[PDB]
Design a binder for these strands. Structure first.
Ligand SMILES: [Mg+2]
Ligand SMILES: [Zn+2]
Ligand SMILES: [Zn+2]
Ligand SMILES: [Zn+2]
Lengths: 52, 17, 49, 328, 67, 51, 249, 261, 123, 115, 46
RNA sequence: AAGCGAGAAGAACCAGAAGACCAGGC
């Protein structure tokens, strides 16, 4: 997929502001690898905002 | 059987995707 | 297969017959549930999930 | 430790020298490289989440860096030119030329084949892109991935030449480990235990003044084990913290006993036996039994739960017998 | 390593007290008088200042990676 | 009002063809310095542009 | 399971209750069969992959079915540590609970009919006793007689045998704690204890309920009362010090 | 069948702490007030950091955590600012966050002490407490000749329940019934215990006589502020926060009753 | 909208029924869910029927309406699986007060009535 | 690795009823108020304020588990009263208490600042 | 393509291409370190 | 009830050591 591997910024919801990398992407829910914590989370793709 | 007497408006919905 | 291991921890808020399993172990382990008209909906939602 | 590229290294954020010190530590240099933190420990039964040799930690203290540590892991690899038939080389693998590329993404690597410091890496991610020429064609991927379920950040990367003059890289990954449920902590008296639960400062009990215990240990761990040194340490520690000195806990010293320590503690407006009136943090009501509380030097042990948790469901198997593998 | 910012127990700021504490020790104060002069009354804050080992000053003796 | 109108104009601009300019009458034809039917002037301008 | 698997009770069936942190959280009474302490112990977990195996575990190896052991025809698990000490101090004669405290402890009674008992003391203030609340904890109408650890042998021979001055001679009648201070002799793995009689007269499910109730209610009351240990408990009067010194001399 | 009529008496008020007494109130209310003083009073604390360069001996997570624990002036602005989660903006804006920046390089031979004085904020109302014009500046990191530290932080509005950095108190000395009249504690040797500062008894006495008709009243408090909020503003914000929590709960309750009504 | 139980044959019919019920409820979130260019007066400035205008607008697009309506916890209600805003069936969560029944529940009867002097019709 | 986010303690995950009312069948005029994302801060005050109500026969609260962030309040009243009405009056009274305490604290602060 | 490295002895930034022996052009030191990544490094101060 | 210009889809799309030894928790 095109989104996998890019660095995304969670722009809405409780995780707003967290930078991460998309490990697996889907039409609806992407999997973000959070840079600030040691964990991977499932977040809706409308909340994401691509960085660069 | 089940029938609509008079259906106004355009109908359908773009939410289904 | 279908085994796990980790440190144990007290939990007075559990019955004697209960065990508190973390979500990582619970996600990594699976149980082959047969599909039936009674659980077809739940199992479909879990597959779509 | 920043210069050493060790395979396994644990560094505590805020080491402290023990308030209750023996006169031999000055020669062990324990004051210069301490291995623990003085914790305001309260020996009490709170919500029974510390029973059977377990402890309750203060979530707010952990939020302030109490016993927080960092785990450094060094991965080493080198390019061997063992023969003209096949040669290894560090280079960013590509799907059209490399054969055995795992489904993990190789974008975190640089064109040199080595990841850069400051990069976030999770389990099964690739950190050294190495390819070996074959006799999807003419080259197989033999890259070095992270150990499974590590989830660290690349601390530094070093490149040099080994004895044979081939390229050699070392990658030190860093993972910040916050003390959580399951981590082992131990005093200097064998009173070891795992963190049963973490309560916030608002939920922990407190003295007449705003002092909540950083740790709560179960009183049942004292009688059978007979670690009276632990209680005397907590008392000498309360006296040292209130007096502004370092308690002398040299083993055989008649100049320091429990009665002298109690008198010194009674001079600072505390119960001579270290007990103190505590208030239930959930209801604010006083606790009928005056709890014993004071500073005790605790240590965090390398045995964390994140390095021990394991699960399996139809994973890889051995070759001779088609049975599951051995080890996390 | 470096003096913590808050006291782990109560939360009182202690990060700005390390230099003053050292200046008092060099000013011939006792550790107790110094901790009182700094306004550290709870023995938890006194623990923070009295049990600290400033290792950062020794880590700064090693040359950096970049000049 | 401005936002919705702008989006509607956006879609019109996307889906509007050159043939729309054929409507209208007595359009000045710069190539001939005289008024010509809109379609004729459009055709002359297109031919000149192509050349 | 926990290794070494010595006896059949070292690996019993449990129901999974997903909880957030990365440890296997166990109830405290089920720690005696495994011989497991929480000082860094690790325990394995095997998930049955079939309805047949699931039914076998649910009908043969469940912890309630594993309460009493055939090795010594007595319970293998029982109340421990904080719970045991707190029940010991909670069933004392001088334990009196206020309306609000009683209400909270009742809130921690799964097997509660929602009916508040008449307080032992009506005037001047309504007060319930620890043995009253524990009477509610006791399931069914089990009848048991035990003796406290501090019971003197000459009491049963002399007067007051049926009205113990020290609140010894644990007596439970009609599933109510008439008198007596509960201890390891009454709530331990010893045969004939309240736990054992509960397992015999009532179902394994009832006994599991009685375990959970004891732990929850007692732990909350203990949260109120408190328990600790320190120098004060290890210090004896100068008189005793002198006596010991003379004895050693 | 209705509420009580509590009173208040402040016995000491300074820029560091506030010592007061609440009378004619229930112990549950006083304990909840203390818990709000500790965990549910919103303040401004750095909660987002972007390290553009860090050559110091302390890793990025260490610098981030240390900046997070630096208290920021939140006296009157915290009521204006909203939560980043509730703000409908992009990453940040002045309505939901306060930008900070740090750029230090040790060019001299002496060790450079990166302190809270180096945190430059975009809003003059939110500045480090040590920076509000006594107390010295908090030390973030020491730098050696040739080392550099450059970052860009953002402060957010939060409370203690989220992280200890959002706890505005440095100790809440809550006490009640100094003389053990209610006997909520049972001193095995009452003569061995010291007297509370709020105690009113002769030195020959150890504790007041038992009061069967007694109820916990006259709760004493000593709220020491960390610097973010004024000691009295902590109390006002706590009472207002608890009243807002109860009001929202009442709204949800009414919506649930009318769900079935 | 206290409760709604739909039995549409296909997802499109279910969506139509849900939207019609949503508009018929006249709920504030329904009204506030209007987005884009919706005019309640024609080119002659004659007042249109607001209910019909809302029906037309939401039938044109209902993503916003479903997003802003709310989700309610749902248990394992036999033969009443919940529906989510994305139109996929769900068991644990559903639109507030909306359930989908597979029993094909399916009134026409003409009941004789008595009408009084003031045109009040009573059965 | 499994650490729940800190915001889980107060923030509702999604489509979560802040408060749920379940009629208790064991005894009449009794109910269970299951409040999500709350703790002893409100459970204790609500319990106390309900105990102050003479028409309330039972008023208690519990936290089923510290890791979970839910709370259960059981309320039983006399037949002429109702548990929902009791819970509503208890909250109204707590609100009045906080309003009055805040006003008197502002007054005390002003009096102390002046002299 | 440039792959700028840092030296362990003099800390001189020298460009080194693949298949090139590791050696500091300024002092001959053989131990090199990679430079900090250019990616976005963000940490919640928690 | 509303009602003021047109649409539809060429091509084709993963990896095993193994053994020994040492330290360590339980
Ligand atoms: Mg053990
Ligand atoms: Zn402190
Ligand atoms: Zn904003
Ligand atoms: Zn060099």
């Amino acid at each position: 997929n095109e989104l996998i591997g890019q660095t995304v910024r969670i722009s809405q919801g409780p995780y707003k502001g967290y930078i991460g990398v998309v490990k697996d992407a889907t039409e609806s829910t992407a999997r973000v690898e959070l840079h600030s914590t040691c964990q991977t989370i499932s977040v809706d793709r409308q909340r994401l905002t691509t960085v660069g | 059987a089940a029938a609509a007497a008079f259906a106004a408006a355009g109908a359908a919905a773009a939410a289904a995707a | 297969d279908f085994s796990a291991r980790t440190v144990i921890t007290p939990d007075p808020n559990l019955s004697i017959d209960q065990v508190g399993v973390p979500r990582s172990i619970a996600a990594n382990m699976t149980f082959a549930e047969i599909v039936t008209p009674f659980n077809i909906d739940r199992l479909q939602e879990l597959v779509r999930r | 430790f920043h210069v050493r590229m060790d395979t396994l290294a644990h560094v505590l954020y805020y080491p402290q020298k023990p308030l209750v010190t023996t006169r031999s530590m000055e020669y062990l240099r324990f004051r210069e490289l301490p291995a623990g933190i003085n914790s305001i420990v309260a020996i009490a039964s709170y919500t029974g989440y510390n029973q059977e040799d377990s402890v309750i930690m203060n979530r707010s203290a952990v939020d302030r860096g109490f016993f927080r540590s960092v785990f450094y892991r060094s991965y080493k690899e080198q390019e061997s030119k063992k023969g003209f038939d096949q040669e290894e080389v560090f280079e960013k693998p590509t799907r059209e030329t490399c054969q055995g590329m795992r489904h993990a993404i190789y974008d975190k690597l640089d064109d040199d084949g080595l990841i850069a410091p400051g990069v976030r890496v999770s389990g099964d991610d690739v950190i050294i892109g190495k390819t070996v020429t074959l006799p999807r064609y003419t080259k197989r991927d033999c890259s070095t991935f992270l150990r499974t379920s590590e989830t660290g950040i690349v601390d530094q990367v070093m490149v040099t030449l080994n004895q044979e003059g081939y390229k050699f890289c070392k990658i030190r990954v860093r993972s910040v480990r916050i003390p959580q449920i399951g981590d082992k902590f131990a005093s200097r008296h064998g009173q070891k235990g795992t963190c049963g639960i973490q309560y916030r400062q608002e939920d922990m009990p407190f003295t007449c003044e705003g002092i909540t215990p950083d740790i709560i240990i179960n009183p049942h761990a004292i009688p059978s084990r007979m670690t009276i040194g632990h209680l005397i340490e907590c008392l000498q520690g309360k006296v040292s913290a209130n007096k502004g000195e370092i308690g002398d806990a040299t083993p055989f010293n008649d100049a320091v006993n429990v009665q002298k320590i109690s008198n010194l503690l009674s001079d600072y407006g505390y119960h001579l036996r270290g007990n103190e009136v505590l208030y239930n943090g959930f209801t604010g009501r006083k606790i009928t039994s005056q709890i014993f509380i004071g500073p005790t030097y605790y240590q965090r042990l390398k045995h964390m739960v994140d390095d021990k948790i394991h699960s399996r469901a139809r994973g890889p198997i051995q070759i001779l017998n088609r049975q599951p593998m051995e080890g996390r | 390593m470096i003096i913590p910012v808050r006291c782990f127990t109560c939360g009182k700021i202690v990060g700005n007290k390390w230099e003053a504490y050292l200046g008092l020790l060099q000013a011939e104060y006792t550790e107790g008088d110094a901790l009182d002069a700094l306004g550290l009354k709870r023995y938890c804050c006194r623990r923070m200042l009295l049990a600290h080992v400033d290792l950062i000053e020794k880590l700064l003796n090693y040359a950096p990676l970049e000049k | 009002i401005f936002e919705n109108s702008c989006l509607e104009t956006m879609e019109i601009v996307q889906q509007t063809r050159v043939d729309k300019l054929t409507q209208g009458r007595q359009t000045y034809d710069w190539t001939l310095n005289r008024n010509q039917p809109a379609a004729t002037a459009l055709a002359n301008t297109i031919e000149v542009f192509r050349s | 399971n926990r290794q070494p698997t010595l006896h059949k009770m070292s690996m019993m069936g449990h129901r999974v209750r997903i909880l957030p942190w990365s440890t296997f959280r166990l109830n405290l009474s089920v720690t005696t069969p495994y011989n497991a302490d929480f000082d860094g112990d690790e325990m394995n977990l095997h998930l049955p992959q079939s309805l047949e195996t699931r039914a076998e575990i649910q009908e043969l190896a469940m912890v309630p079915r594993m309460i009493v052991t055939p090795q010594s025809n007595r319970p293998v698990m029982g109340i421990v540590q904080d719970t045991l000490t707190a029940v010991r101090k909670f069933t004392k004669r001088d334990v009196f609970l206020e309306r609000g405290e009683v209400m909270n402890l009742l809130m921690f009674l799964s097997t509660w009919d929602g009916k508040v008992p008449q307080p032992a003391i009506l005037k001047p203030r309504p007060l319930w006793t620890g043995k009253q609340i524990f009477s509610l904890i006791i399931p069914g109408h089990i009848n048991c007689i035990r003796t406290h650890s501090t019971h003197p042998d000459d009491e049963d021979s002399g007067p007051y045998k049926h009205i113990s001055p020290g609140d010894t001679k644990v007596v439970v009648e009609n599933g109510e704690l008439i008198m007596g201070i509960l201890c390891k002799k009454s709530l331990g793995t010893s045969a004939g204890s309240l736990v054992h009689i509960s397992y015999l007269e009532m179902g394994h499910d009832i006994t599991r309920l009685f375990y959970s109730n004891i732990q929850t209610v007692i732990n909350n009351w203990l949260l109120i009362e408190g328990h600790t240990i320190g120098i004060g408990d290890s210090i004896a009067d100068s008189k005793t010090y002198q006596d010991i010194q003379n004895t050693i001399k | 069948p209705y509420a009580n009529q509590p009173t208040v008496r402040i016995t000491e008020l300074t820029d560091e702490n506030v010592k007061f007494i609440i009378e004619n109130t229930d112990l549950a209310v006083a304990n909840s007030i203390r818990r709000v003083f500790i965990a549910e009073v919103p303040i401004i604390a750095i909660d987002w950091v972007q390290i553009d360069a860090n050559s110091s001996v302390l890793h990025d997570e260490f610098i981030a955590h240390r900046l997070g624990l630096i208290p920021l002036t939140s006296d009157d602005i915290v009521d204006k600012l909203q939560y980043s989660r509730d703000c409908t903006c992009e990453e940040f804006c002045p309505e939901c966050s306060v930008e900070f920046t740090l750029d230090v390089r040790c060019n001299e031979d002496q060790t450079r002490h990166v302190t809270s004085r180096d945190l430059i904020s975009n809003s003059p109302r939110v500045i480090p407490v040590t920076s509000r014009n006594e107390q010295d500046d908090i030390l973030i990191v020491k730098l050696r000749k040739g080392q550099e530290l450059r970052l860009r932080a953002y402060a957010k509005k939060g409370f203690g329940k989220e992280h200890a950095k959002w706890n505005p108190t440095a100790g809440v000395a809550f006490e009640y019934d100094p003389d053990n009249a209610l006997r909520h504690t049972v001193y095995p040797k009452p003569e061995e215990w010291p007297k509370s500062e709020y105690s009113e008894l002769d030195e020959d006495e150890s504790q007041a006589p038992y009061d069967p008709n007694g109820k916990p009243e006259r709760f004493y408090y000593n709220v020491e502020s960390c610097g973010s909020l004024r000691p009295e503003t902590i109390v006002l914000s706590a009472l207002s926060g608890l009243k807002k929590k109860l009001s929202d709960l009442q709204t949800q309750l009414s919506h649930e009753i009318q769900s079935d009504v | 909208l206290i409760q709604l139980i739909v039995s549409g044959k296909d997802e499109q019919s279910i969506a139509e029924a849900i939207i019609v019920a949503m508009v018929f409820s006249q709920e504030d979130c329904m009204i506030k869910a209007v987005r884009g260019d919706l005019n309640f007066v024609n080119r002659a400035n004659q007042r249109l029927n607001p209910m019909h205008q809302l029906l037309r607008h939401f039938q044109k697009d209902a993503k916003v309406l479903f997003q802003n309506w709310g989700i309610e916890p749902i248990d394992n209600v036999m033969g009443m699986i919940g529906i989510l805003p994305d139109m996929t069936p769900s068991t644990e969560m559903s639109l507030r007060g909306v359930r989908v029944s597979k029993m094909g529940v399916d009134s026409t009867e003409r009941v004789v009535v008595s009408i009084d002097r003031f045109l009040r019709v009573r059965d | 690795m499994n650490a729940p986010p800190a915001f889980e303690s107060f923030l509702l995950f999604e489509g979560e009823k802040k408060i749920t009312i379940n009629k208790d069948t064991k005894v009449p005029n009794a109910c269970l108020f299951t409040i999500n994302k709350e703790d002893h801060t409100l459970g204790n005050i609500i319990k106390s304020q309900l105990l102050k109500d003479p028409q309330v026969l039972f008023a208690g609260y519990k936290v089923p588990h510290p890791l979970e962030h839910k709370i259960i309040i059981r309320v039983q009243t006399t037949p002429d009263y109702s548990p929902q009405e009791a819970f509503t009056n208890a909250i109204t009274d707590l609100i009045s208490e906080l309003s009055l305490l805040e006003e008197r604290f502002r007054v005390a602060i002003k009096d102390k600042q002046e002299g | 393509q440039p792959m700028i490295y840092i030296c362990g002895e003099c800390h001189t930034e020298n460009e080194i291409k693949s298949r090139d022996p590791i050696r500091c052009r300024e002092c001959g030191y053989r131990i090199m370190y990679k430079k900090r990544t250019k990616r976005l490094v963000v940490f919640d101060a928690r």
